[PDB]
Structure formats: C-alpha cells, structure tokens
Amino acid sequence: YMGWWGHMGSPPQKGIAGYTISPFAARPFAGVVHAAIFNTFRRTKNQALFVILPVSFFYYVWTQASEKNEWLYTKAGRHELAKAL
Amino acid sequence: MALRKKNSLLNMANSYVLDSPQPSNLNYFWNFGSLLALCLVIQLATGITLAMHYTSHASLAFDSVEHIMRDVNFGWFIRYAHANTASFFFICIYAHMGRNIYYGSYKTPRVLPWSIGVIIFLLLIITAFMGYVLVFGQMSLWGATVICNLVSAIPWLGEDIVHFLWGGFSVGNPTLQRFFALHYLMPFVLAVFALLHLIALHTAGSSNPLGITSNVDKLSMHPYYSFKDLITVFAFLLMFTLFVFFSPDKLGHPDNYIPANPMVTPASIVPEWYLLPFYAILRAIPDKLGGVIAMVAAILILLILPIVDRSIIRGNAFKPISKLLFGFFICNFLLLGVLGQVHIEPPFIVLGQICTIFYFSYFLILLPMVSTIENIFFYIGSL
Amino acid sequence: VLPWSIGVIIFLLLIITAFMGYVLVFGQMSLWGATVICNLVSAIPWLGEDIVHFLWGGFSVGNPTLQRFFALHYLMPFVLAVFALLHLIALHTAGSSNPLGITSNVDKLS
Amino acid sequence: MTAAEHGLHPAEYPWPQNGMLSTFDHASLRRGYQVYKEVCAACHSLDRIAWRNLVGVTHTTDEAKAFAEELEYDDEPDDEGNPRKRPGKLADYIPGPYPNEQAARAANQGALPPDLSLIAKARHGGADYIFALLTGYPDEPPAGVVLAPGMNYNPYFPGGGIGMARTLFDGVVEYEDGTPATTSQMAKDVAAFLTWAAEPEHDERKKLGLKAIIVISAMLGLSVYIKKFKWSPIKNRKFIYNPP
Amino acid sequence: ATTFYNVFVKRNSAFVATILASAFVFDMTFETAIDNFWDRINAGKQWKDIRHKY
Amino acid sequence: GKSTYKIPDFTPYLKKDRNTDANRLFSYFMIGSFGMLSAAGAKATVQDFLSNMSASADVLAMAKVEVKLGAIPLGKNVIIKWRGKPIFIRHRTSEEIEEANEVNVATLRDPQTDDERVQKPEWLVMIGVCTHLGCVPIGEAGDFGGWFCPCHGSHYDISGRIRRGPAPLNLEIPEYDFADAETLVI
Amino acid sequence: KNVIIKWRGKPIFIRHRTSEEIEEANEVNVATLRDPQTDDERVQKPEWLVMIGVCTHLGCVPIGEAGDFGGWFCPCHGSHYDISGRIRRGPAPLNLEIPEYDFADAETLVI
Amino acid sequence: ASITSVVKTSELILKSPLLSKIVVPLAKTYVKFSGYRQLGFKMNDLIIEETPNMQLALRRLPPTESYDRVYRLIRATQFSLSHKLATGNDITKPEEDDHYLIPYILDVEAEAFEKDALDNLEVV
Amino acid sequence: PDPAIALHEAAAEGPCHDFKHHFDECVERVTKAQEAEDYDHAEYKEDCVEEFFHLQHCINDNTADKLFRVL
C-alpha cells in the first residue's frame, strides 16, 4: 500500500506545481508572534470543549466521591458509614 | 547508485532512518515512537550498568541497591535515571497508544503493527514489574507475591504454577534471582518486538493526523523527522532532568525503601503509577479469576479495536462525536488510575466498578455504536 | 567479503563472551583469566594501566569485576546473535558459496 | 480511612535544602549528627553510613578517624585462628546499638526501632515527617484515645500510638557550636542530618541538575530553531493547481 | 565575515574541529562558572564554608 | 491560480540578504552552537556515566598493612595480602644477596641494582604480581632461581628483576617502611 | 491478641481469642459465606485460632484487627476476614488456610 | 464497515419521514462541526482507501476527478502541517461537497458482495 | 526555651481560635462522658482526635515558616 520513492503509489499527479524556497532564504520565525497568539488561540478554542467536557465531568465525579469519602470517616458520617458497610 | 542504497546492510538502515518516506504532516504526537526508542536505549544503558553493580541474591539485593546509591560513582544518577525512565517509558507508551487510538492507527492496513504493539505493551508491563521486584523492598516483595499469584486464577494447575514461578513456597531468594534473569532478558525481547512492529508498519507507512493517504505527499524521515524528534528528545530530557536531579523520588513509593519483610505487608498498598488503572480494575471485580481476567482483558481488549471500530473514516480528527467519546474514555482511564491509589473504602468501591464497566463498554458498545452513527451522519450530512 | 568481515567480528565477540563466561565461575583459573585479559589493555601505553583499573573496578580482580563480567557475559551473546544475523543478511546478497566455487545461479534449491 | 489511622500529615517546613539550587546546611548536618550520636543512637542504627561518609560533609578526616578509632570492630582471625578486634577505620560502618532484631525489640517493649539511614526516604513527608514526629508529642493525648501498653501518643504517626517515647527535651544535647539546644532546634538538626543520611548525593545531584537544566534548555531552544529552519521549505511550500 | 565563514565553517573538518574546541572551552568555563555560582547561592552552607573551624 | 511562471508570493518569508555570507553564517552558528552543547553534554554524560565503572568509594579503602619479621626464617618468601595484590617478602640469605649483586646491570630489560630495590638487603619486599599480565609468580622456581611466572614463563631474580620472558618491568616495590627492625608497614 | 509465626516463610497468625470473640464467630449463618465453614471446623481448640496468614486472594498478609468484620483485612485488594478467619467481603475466594497443627502440650503447639 | 452498509442505512433514514425530519438536521450540523470542509476536503476524500476494494474504486475515477482528488489531499496535507485552515475558495462549500466516489465504490462492493454470495450458492 | 511552645500558643489563641474551642468543647464532652458510669459498657466511645487534628493542622500551617525562621 505504500511504495517507495519513484513508485510511491500516488494516483497519477498532474497539474500541481509546487514551489518552495530555500531554508536559508526564508525567515524560519516569520510571523511567529501572530501564530503564537492568534493561530494557537484559534486551534485551542476549536478543541477546547473536547478536553473541558470530560475533564470537568470526571473532576466533578472525583470531587463528589472524595468529599463523600472524607465525610464518611468523620464523626458526623458514622451512621452513613455503618450503612455503607 | 548511492552506497546507502547499494549495500544490503546500509540499505536496511537507510530504509528505516533516512530514506523512509513519511507523511509530511505528522504532528508532535508522532514523536512518542522515537521517545520510546530513547527510553528503551536509556533503560538498556542504565539497566546494564546497574546490572554491573547489583546483586540478585535476596540477602544482598536491597543492600546492593543501597550500595549503588551510596558508593558507586554516579550510582545515584544511574539508579534514578533507570527508575525514572521506567515512569517516562509509560507516559510515552500510553501517549503513543493514545495517539494510535485517537488517529485510528489500529485500522487496516495497520492492524498488524497495532497487534504486535499490544504485545509490546504487555511485555513492558512485565519487564517494568520484574524490575520493580529486583529492589526487594517491601513493595517489591509484595508485588512479586501478587503477580505470581495471578496464575493461581488458572484452575487446578494454577497453585502448582505459582510455586514453580517462585521456586519455593513463597517469594524468596529463588524468585528474586529468576526475576533478575528475566528482567535483564525481557527488554531485549521487547526491543525485538518494537522492531517487529516497525517492520510490520513499513508496509503501510505511518498513518497521519488526517487519516487520509499520504502517498500523495511524502517527506524523507531525515532530515525532517530526525530534527523534529530532537525537539522532543530535548523536551523529554528536560522533564527527565527535573525528576532525576531535582525530585528523584516523586514518582516512587516510600515503602520500597524498607527492606522486604515477608511477615507484614504495608497497610498502604499502591503499585506503580502506571499499573494503577489495571490495579483498580482488579480491585473492582470481587472474584479471584474474574479480577484477573478483567485486568488482563483490559489490555487484550485493545486487540479488538480493529473489529469494533466500524468507521469508514480513519481516526478522530474529523469525527466530533468520536472525539468526545475518546475524551471520556481517556478521562475514565485516568479516573481508574486515581481510584487505584485511594483506600478501598466507600464510595470509591462502587465508583471503581462503574469506571471499570465504562472502560469495557467503550470497546464493546459505545465505539461500535458511535462509529456506525457517524458513518451515517457523514453520508447524510454531506448529501 | 562483507559476511566474512562481520564474521571475524563474531569470532572476536565469541572469544570475549566465552571468556567472560569462564570468569563467572570464580574458580582459580577464572580469577587468573580475568587478571590476564584485563591486563591486555596494559599493553596500550600511558592510559593503558588506568584502563586496567577501570575494567576491574578495583586494584585487582575482585567482586566488582565479577559482577561486571556477569552483566557483560549475559549481554554479549545477544550482541553476538545480532552480528550473526547481520552476517547472514550480508550474505543474502550473494547467496551461499558452494564447494565448487562456481556460480550456483544456474541450479538453486529451496 | 479515619484521620487517626492515617496520621496527621506533617507541615511543610522551609528546609534549607528545599529549593532547586539549595544544598543542605552542613553546619546543621554536623549538629544533627551530634543529636543522632547522643540521643537516637541508643536505639537506632545507622547501618548504611560509614565513617568515611561524614568526611568532608560534617567532619574532617581527622575527626571521623577519631570517631572510628574509639570503637572495636571484628578483625580477621589471628595466626592461631582466634577471633580478634581492631580499632575502627574510615571504611567501617557506624555500628548499631543492638546485635540483632530480637535484642532491639527486647529493649523496646517489643517494638523495633528502624534503621535510620533510609528513614527520610522511607516515609511520606521525609524530613518534615521526622521533624513533625520528634516534636509532635503532646503533653496529653487527645481525650478519648486509648493507647496500647507501652505506646505514646503522637498524631503524626499512623494509628497515633508509637512505641518511641518523646526523647528530645531542651538541653539533652550540648551543641559544640553554642547553638541553643531546644527541642525544635535539635529536631530540625537531626531531621536534616537524617535526610542527608538518606540521600547523601543530594548536594551533587542538584548541582549537576542545574548544569543539565541550563544545557538542556539551550539545546532545546536551539533544536527548535534548527527544526523550524529545516522545516521551513515544507511549511512555506505553495501550490498552483491547473486542473488538466 | 565571509572570512570567518571560510575559515571555520566552510570545511566540515574545520567546523567540527571548531565545535569540539568550543565544546572544550564551554565545558571548562561552564564548570568553573557554575562552581562559583553554586558557592555564592549556598554561601555559608557548604562544607568548604564551615571547614575552616576545624 | 493559472500561470505556473508566476511564482506564488513568498515576500512574507524571503530574507533580503539571503545570499550574504553573514546570512549562512548565522544559521551555521545555530547549528554549531547546538553541536557545541551536544558535544559538551555528550562528553559530560559519557564521563559521568562511565565513571560508575571506576573503583567505587567502598573499594577505594586503603590498607596500611603491618607485618612481623621474626616469624620469617632465612631462605623463605612470604605472601602478605595488601590491596588484594600479594606482597612477596623474602628473608634473603647472604649468598642470595651476593648472587643478585652479580648480574651486570647493563643486560637487564629493566636496569636496576638490588640496592635500588631493597632499602634493607635482608628484606626483599615486592608487589608479587608479574609485570607481564598480572599473575603471581611462583617463588623459588625460575631459571634465575627467584620467581617464575607460570602464566607466560617470565623469570624473576633474587632481586625480583626480570631476566627472561615477556614481562617488561621488574617486580614493583611498594612503599614500605621499617617502623621497627622486626616489623614493616606497607 | 494475634501473633505472627514464620513457618515455611509464610506467616502464621495465632490469635488468643476471647470468649465473646468466639461467640461473634459462631453467629454468622454458614449459608451466607463464600467458603462455608464454622469455627469448629477451623480451630481444634476455640481459644487458638491458628491460620496461614496469607490472604487467599493473591497472597498478601492481611492486617489483623482491621477489617469490617473486625478480624483481618487484606490491604492489597480489600478482602475482609472474620474472627474465624473466614472471608466475608472482597475478592478472596477461600477462608484463610489452616495449617496442620497439633497441641503437643496445652501451652505449646507445633505446625 | 462497508460503504454499501452506510449507504443503504442512510437511504432507510431518508425514506422514513419522521427519521429524516430528526436526522437530516443532526447530520448537517455534525458535518459542519466535523470541519473537514475547512481543510478543503470533500466528504469522500476521507474514506479509508487502503483496502483492495477502495483501491479498485479509486482506479475507476475519471482522470479529472482523480487529479483533483490528489490536489485536494496535497493541499489538505499542507494545511494540516502548517496548522492553518483553508480560506476563501479553498473552503469546501456545501454545493461542492459531491459524493464523487460513492458511485464507484458502491459498484466495486456490489460486485464483491455478489461474488461472496454466489460463491455460496446451493443448486436446489 | 523552646521557640515552638510560644508560637503554638500564639497561633492557638489567634488564627486557630475556632479550632481551639472545638478541641476544648470536645474534651469537656468526652471527659464528662467517661465520668458517667457504664461508659465502659457502651457501644460508641467518642474521641477528640478529629478536632485535635483540625487544630494541629491549622497550627502547623500558621507556624511552620515562623518556627524555622528562628532556628
């Protein structure tokens, strides 16, 4: 499914002209400020919910469980612990 | 024709590290493969070095590790480097398996490197564990007891296998010396399998974060990914340095600095941070055999991802619903990790069971269902 | 020539492997053997003598030496299996020679 | 678990050695050795430390030879093969108070005083735990605590009941540097000393880490410049498509 | 500046020689510099600072 | 969009002085700095790491071994362990000393006279490790009736000077002092 | 009190059970017990609970006096043993094994 | 899963009035959030092609459609590695998101599944 | 004299006054409960460990830095 240089197995390409410049001719950090601020904000915003939703949910679940556990092993939580065991 | 292509030996190296055609758009999550290679090299170097100083006899093992810390020049470094890299190895390998699950690297045509990978993951667990036992501190001895008793789950012959693996009636000198032999051996087996899964991958080439073919646009492995992999080498070494030099014991259990006492097990039994997810799984199930099966199945079930992912699209970049499901799966695997280290108390007993069910239901129910529905949403949604 | 030359290195590694293995018994011949081989580096001038001490990990062959020979004797065979594999891979370009020394391209057998 | 069963978690004290670039205070180490020698060594061994380990840390070569030479250690048998003792040398280990575990337990109402060479690494909390424990014996156990016989109440120890009694009292040691030997001062010194005992490479380790952090930071910065530089042809690549 | 390129960078033999000689200089000076810095931030703490009493 | 001779706009990235030697030199400064820190780092890593194999602190304990001399009869050689290496102590007879003082120093791989070797003619003290590859020569045997290394057949003298065989140097003399006339320390 | 005697490297828990402890043990209906046994089957003398103190799950040694059935609790996977050393809660499948022990005297037992 | 499966199931949904009323709006939103159009892909560019069947379907594409597919993949690969999105004309507009490949793969698979079926025929 | 004695007392009367009273009340209740007969044959014997730990944890937070500053 993948070949090697010369016969990589791309469907025939025609009509794409690719241009690039030398690494020595380019500023490697051109527009780094713009990218670091605006591009990273864009990419972060677009992915934020995919991280925030499960982290916030499982942090809530952990928080509730750890608070209950703490409370069960207090004097006030004696009775509820006795029922749990 | 270039020597690197002409000469059979160079040609094999060339095909892996120099001319290897890679997709041009691999992101930083493709760097874990080389970090795991670097971890494996560090572990071999520090490991073989510790083996030059360590004594496998149970009467001397713990003391030889103290001698390494105290008397051997740079012994502290070599020991902590070995111990900490074992932790980094697992961060990197979960990252690498994470990457593979998120981007559908397990799908055809890469089921073989994936499946060999699942075995590398099991071997790493057994290697790292066998290595944990060699210290012969309190956790070491107890860990040995439990792992060697997982075969007691196997009915009838089980109990006899346990005694055979201990070479005794309990974990003792015999066990420690055979763990040393095998802990030295297992990493070379693991490097074979690591190589094999690359050879299996070389038929299809790396996947890429879009999950499309990269046959249209390839880049030589060097210089592009060689230099890309250095960034993570140095980022890894920065994190390595912070642990090894500044906080070498953050990732460790205090109890392993107590010599093994077969008469007590510590009241706070908590295994290595990386085994915690499966340990919570083992705790969750209240049956002996059940608990063991579930724990092993939690790794072996990765083998079925090629089947149960019914998507026509490779990986999750373009599947909002699958990405959310994957987020919950990952967070649940971290929750299992957390529950592995709390006390076995309410309410975490029930919670650990719910997380265990969710872990398995991702492979058995949710992934097959979500992937089916998203297929339909792509087709309907684009008409 | 390549499988041959890799082979010559396998031969050296076998000598070093089997030797390091001899030393692990730590009988009389073992200890003396260790002394002799580590002192072959004493031949190397100047640094040579310091190297000897570095290899022994001491002023004489003793515990440090034996533990490091154990480590390397376990290791060396896997290195030797790599080289054994490599000389086969090198040979696979030409194929085996045969007792006539003629080409066998005319008549091959699986 | 209940708080009792866990032990109170020790406060985080600002030790001299906390901080990425901070060594132990060696003066404190020396003072702490003197506390170990005059209080703890009655019951606790320090088996993994040799006299030579104090040299150039807490004591000069001569002071440590003097400490070793005061003791008798097992020599090689004499020419008739009768056992002999010799005066200690710097390579000898600091000797324990007890010949075996059973003798240790006999002297401690059944409880075994652990070896202290590793105790700072062997307990959650480390220095802070040792300092909290040594200073944390209340005059009266909290009302309602029933101590097992020969146990002393100390909240920092898990379970609350520790077989070690309070041992540091103001002026049990007379420091040779004229520092006021208060319970807190001695606990801080001995805690520091024990932490050194557990991790004697600490000072070197942090210094090499500093050099490593600097080199690795620079290499990481440069590696990123070089990666961006080498990748710029690919990042900057532009396509013109004319459908055929 | 051309001159500097021509001497130290153009020939790889020269460039690698320059890198290794720079690594030698860096290694020796960095060691000395960190030693002094480490002694200043941990002043009065280290054995060398209390050794004089004995 | 259409013409392939209209190169896409690269002005946002193109350096004006791309063809200057200053321009190349800057990037080679970065690559060279990275090579320099890699070289400093590699050397530091290898040096520190390999030092683990050098004698550990516990091994580096020195001996100072005191031996009596009243015990040792005339015409005998003892073996005292000192730093794991054996020390040959021979109580040489008058005629043995004479035999040693005979050989013309000229014809000796390692030219030394007994006077240089011993500080007391009646106490040949040597590090009894053969200077060839490091076996311990069997005393009284030889061909120069001193010591013979059985490993590669090198013969030492009654001064412990090498006479025949591969060994290049004469048997090393430790730093030894007669504290008393009946005890030496090594 | 419970002692721990090493025997074949495995620990032996010897508990000197009080009258009311024995009573507590004799209570649980045998019906509801993973491994159904009564104390009478386990001990040959009600005042000497002798067990191989290795947890029947994976093989840690349970911490005595702790638990939820106030006997022994294996800290490894949270299995609770009774005052008979019967398993009540947690993954352990069997009750704590009883060695072959004989009272030679009334004040000494051999294992 | 096979494209045939996906296409038949989609057709079952588009038939049922109730189902289409609730599913078509969901699927359109899903596709907007999927965001493959923001790299200038057509939906069909994302179908896994490393399969005998798909390789055969892709060989059946008209040269025009094939060349354009190569271009969109090259261009998307370039967006991906630059971490940019398509802008302007490179963004796939809903009207350009044509199922150019679905007819070809459905024909390939139709034959492949008929072949499997007929390999298992039983003369009666 | 021991700097800790003064710092602990200061922190108890000051920033940890709430927790000092809780511990005080607790001990009063428990001692009184122990004084009452047939306490030995009760099911639940109340302790003051929890309150003590709240107090000590508080005192430690307000003292640790101050104490080490005077050593």
Ligand code: HEC
């Ligand atoms: C005369 C006895 C005695 C003296 C003096 C003594 N200890 Fe102990 N110590 C013990 C005993 C017994 C234990 C075990 C307590 C137990 O496990 O119940 C112990 C336990 C400890 C522990 C660890 C408790 C644990 O977490 O297991 C430390 C740390 C400790 N001692 C340090 C010291 C220091 C520091 C000193 C004095 C500076 C000291 N001890 C003085 C008898 C003593």
Ligand code: HEM
């Ligand atoms: C010693 C451990 C391992 C090493 C050293 C290793 C190394 C690598 C390397 C270098 C690659 C190619 C570059 C990359 O994609 O990162 C790779 C790819 C891959 N690895 Fe691993 N790997 C290891 C463990 C695993 C494990 C445990 C799995 C699976 C469970 C795995 C599955 C794969 C797969 C499926 C690929 C192809 C992914 C793709 O490029 O799309 N590997 N591995």
Ligand code: HEM
């Ligand atoms: C994947 C490769 C390896 C992994 C994941 C691994 C993991 C570990 C771990 C976790 C330990 C416990 C360390 C500790 O807490 O002290 C350890 C110890 C050890 N490992 Fe390895 N190891 C690996 C390779 C090797 C190799 C190749 C050797 C060669 C002998 C080796 C030799 C040792 C020795 C001697 C110890 C015990 C001394 C000690 O604890 O430091 N290891 N290993």
Ligand code: HEM
């Ligand atoms: C671990 C040790 C070695 C193993 C397992 C090994 C194995 C083999 C095998 C299987 C072959 C092909 C079949 C055959 O001709 O017998 C072979 C061929 C060869 N081996 Fe070795 N070999 C080893 C050591 C050596 C050494 C030490 C040399 C050379 C000094 C050597 C040189 C060769 C050469 C030149 C061939 C090609 C010979 C031919 O077929 O005409 N090998 N070896």
Ligand SMILES: CCCCCC[C@H]1C(=O)O[C@H](C)[C@H](NC(=O)c2cccc(NC=O)c2O)C(=O)O[C@@H](C)[C@@H]1OC(=O)CC(C)C
């Ligand atoms: C010296 C020739 C021997 C051939 C094997 C040596 C190693 C080898 O092939 O290296 C390659 C550099 C490889 N990386 C990749 O494929 C790679 C591919 C695509 C992207 C990236 N990165 C992205 O940004 C990559 O990093 C790698 O790290 O894999 C190691 C594990 C290999 O070790 C072995 O299997 C043998 C043993 C040491 C485990």
Ligand SMILES: CCCCCCCCCCCCO[C@@H]1O[C@H](CO)[C@@H](O[C@H]2O[C@H](CO)[C@@H](O)[C@H](O)[C@H]2O)[C@H](O)[C@H]1O
């Ligand atoms: C330490 C272990 C010792 C051996 C490890 C060295 C690297 C692993 C090589 C084993 C895999 C070789 O398996 C085979 O080798 C050949 C020879 O280059 C390679 O062949 C690859 O590159 C060549 C030219 O560069 C192409 O003609 C070919 O289309 C392509 O598949 C592939 O990698 C693989 O098809």
Ligand SMILES: CCCCCCCCCCCCO[C@@H]1O[C@H](CO)[C@@H](O[C@H]2O[C@H](CO)[C@@H](O)[C@H](O)[C@H]2O)[C@H](O)[C@H]1O
């Ligand atoms: C790829 C292999 C090539 C062959 C290279 C051979 C290298 C092996 C020689 C080991 C050299 C060690 O030599 C010794 O190094 C240590 C550090 O390790 C130096 O030690 C110096 O720095 C270290 C920290 O790095 C401090 O702990 C120490 O107080 C200080 O003296 C010694 O000054 C030097 O005597």
Ligand SMILES: O=C1C(O)=C([C@H]2CC[C@@H](c3ccc(Cl)cc3)CC2)C(=O)c2ccccc21
């Ligand atoms: O009880 C346990 C325990 O269960 C594990 C566990 C967790 C991970 C397990 C595992 C996970 C995955 C695989 Cl493929 C195989 C084993 C191995 C046993 C330990 O490592 C441990 C260490 C020290 C003391 C007790 C214990």
Ligand SMILES: O=C1C(O)=C([C@H]2CC[C@@H](c3ccc(Cl)cc3)CC2)C(=O)c2ccccc21
């Ligand atoms: O004196 C020797 C000695 O000289 C050799 C050896 C030295 C090196 C061996 C050797 C090393 C390298 C090569 Cl390439 C070939 C042979 C051959 C004989 C020994 O092996 C030996 C073993 C046991 C006791 C004494 C001795």
Ligand code: FES
């Ligand atoms: S070893 Fe002494 S003669 Fe060669």
Ligand code: FES
């Ligand atoms: S080990 Fe006893 S509970 Fe699992």
